[PDB]
Structures are given as C-alpha cells and as structure tokens.
Amino acid sequence: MDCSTNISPKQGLDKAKYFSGKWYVTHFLDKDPQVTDQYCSSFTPRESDGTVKEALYHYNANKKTSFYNIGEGKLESSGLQYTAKYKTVDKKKAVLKEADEKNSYTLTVLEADDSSALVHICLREGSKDLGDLYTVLTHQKDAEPSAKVKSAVTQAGLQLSQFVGTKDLGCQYDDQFTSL
C-alpha cells in the first residue's frame, strides 16, 4: 500500500509555527489500515540545527491502551519535511528499542499557522511502505482547526469529511509524556 507520491512541504512556512507547543490530531485520513483499530495521537516536535526530535504518543481507542515513541531525523533541503528513525519507549521515556536503520517515517508539513497544521506521514519498514496518513493538528484537544488548514485539506485534493474525527473516539492523552 504505497504512500502518496505527490507530497512536498509548503514553501514559505515559518518553522517556528510548526515546532511550537504540542499537537493533537483532530482528524486523520488513512488510505489503507492493516488494523481496523482507530487511534488518537499527540506529539511534541522540536528542531535545532536541522535536527528534529519529537515525543510521540498513540492511544488505541478500541483497546484503550497507549504506546510511546521518540522520533529523530534531519530536515530536508526542501523545507519542513523530515525522515525520522524512532525509539520505542515506556511512559517514563525509558528506551525499550533504539532507533534502527530499516524502520522510519517521513513527515511532510503541508500547512501550519498559529493554531493548527496539516501534515502527511508515510511509515516504512525496509523496502515496504506500511502506511500513509494525513493528519489535521491543533494545539489543544478538540480545538477547531483553522480556516487556513481546512483550505489546505481541500487544496491537497481531499475532503475533510472523509477523515476520521478523533473527538468521537473517546481519546485519552498523556500530557505528562508530551510536556517537554
């Protein structure tokens, strides 16, 4: 299930707006889920000298469990786009597995403003694309995405209505994990 091809970062985006606060996923669009479980997610991206580090949380809304990761990658020469390898961690950020060289994700920022963002994530393992997602992001749980980001969704060729809205899933977040 190939990741979407025509994906490049929006040029002219202020990186200070993207590497800002934390993000909560309000809406996600999954091309082809392998599992039918639905997730909520929040993460806290930071950048220094072209290196991105981010604390990542997933909550399985069906099973009511959560898992944790730390991503690390370099910004491309193209703008706000990065391929990250990732550690697997417990809730206290103790390392369970270190980043390896065959598992990565590529995150492309399509829009970002003071309240909201739209990003695309392709997850890979070895020679295979595992999964492609678009995600609408806000800085507080269940905040409304901005008009600018809703327009970004339409301009990406998508319909926001076809995304899964996470409000309905009964998400639980770990704001301690994502603080810092």
Q: Which residues bind ligand HEM (CB under 6 A)?
A: 25, 28, 35, 39-41, 43, 56, 58, 69, 86, 88, 105, 107, 121, 123, 133, 135, 166
Q: Are 165 and 27 in contact (CB under 8 A)?
A: yes
User: Which CB, 57 or 115, lies closer to ligand HEM?
Assistant: 57
Nearer to ligand HEM, 41 or 146 (CB): 41
Tell me the closest approach of the beta carbon of residue 68 to ligand HEM, in angstroms. 9
Q: How far is the CB of 102 from ligand HEM (least distance, A)?
A: 11
Which of 87, 90, 78, 79 lies closest to 105, judged by CA? 87
Q: Least distance to ligand HEM from the beta carbon of 147, Å? A: 22
Q: Which residue lies nearer to ligand HEM by CB, 85 or 150?
A: 85
> Tokens 């327009």, residue?
151
Task: State which residue, 10 or 169, has the beta carbon closest to ligand HEM.
Answer: 169
User: Which DSSP helix (H) or strand (E) runs through 134?
Assistant: strand 128-138
Find the shortest distance in angstroms from Cβ 51 to ligand HEM.
15
The dihedrals phi and psi of 151, each to the nearest 5 degrees, come to -65, -35
Q: Are 24 and 139 in contact (CB under 8 A)?
A: yes
CA dist 82 → 19, 47, 90, 130, 172 (Å): 13, 11, 24, 17, 27
User: Per the annotation, does 27 bind a ligand?
Assistant: no
Rg, the chain, Cα only: 15
- Give the annotated binding-site residues: 58
- Give the annotated binding-site residues for heme: 58
